[PDB]
Structure 1
Amino acid sequence: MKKYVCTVCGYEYDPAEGDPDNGVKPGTAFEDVPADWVCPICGAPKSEFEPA
């Protein structure tokens, strides 16, 4: 799918690996990531990401 970048710190969300530690299964499109999911490294909200 499409990777998304955290505009605050550069952390990249990769659909291919999801975020298992938070129940985000691999294959999860960023659009489908939980609304309250935040960037693992800076805490920024989903609204602060940008399609890469």
Structure 2
Amino acid sequence: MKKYVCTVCGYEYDPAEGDPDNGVKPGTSFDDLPADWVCPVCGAPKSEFEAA
């Protein structure tokens, strides 16, 4: 149950509701997220996502 925020745009990701805008299920945590995931804002790796 950890949230993160992009360090490029400044958008926060809510794994609680998932990202259906991309096709991600509402039951997928950040650790569950895919390895080919990218910010829904720009499209950067988790390497750009830190802990809120």
**Does the pair score TM above 0.5?**
yes
1:5-33 CA distance string (max 9 Å, x none) = 01111111111111113332113211111
TM-score scaled by length of structure 1: 0.79
Runs of 5+ consecutive residues of structure 2 not aligned to the other structure: none
> RMSD between aligned alpha carbons?
1.3
Across the two proteins, how many residue pairs are aligned to each other?
52
Runs of 5+ consecutive residues of structure 1 not aligned to the other structure: none
TM-score scaled by length of structure 2: 0.79
Whether the aligned pair in 2 keeps the contact of 1:6 and 1:48 (CA below 8 Å) is yes
More helix by share: 1
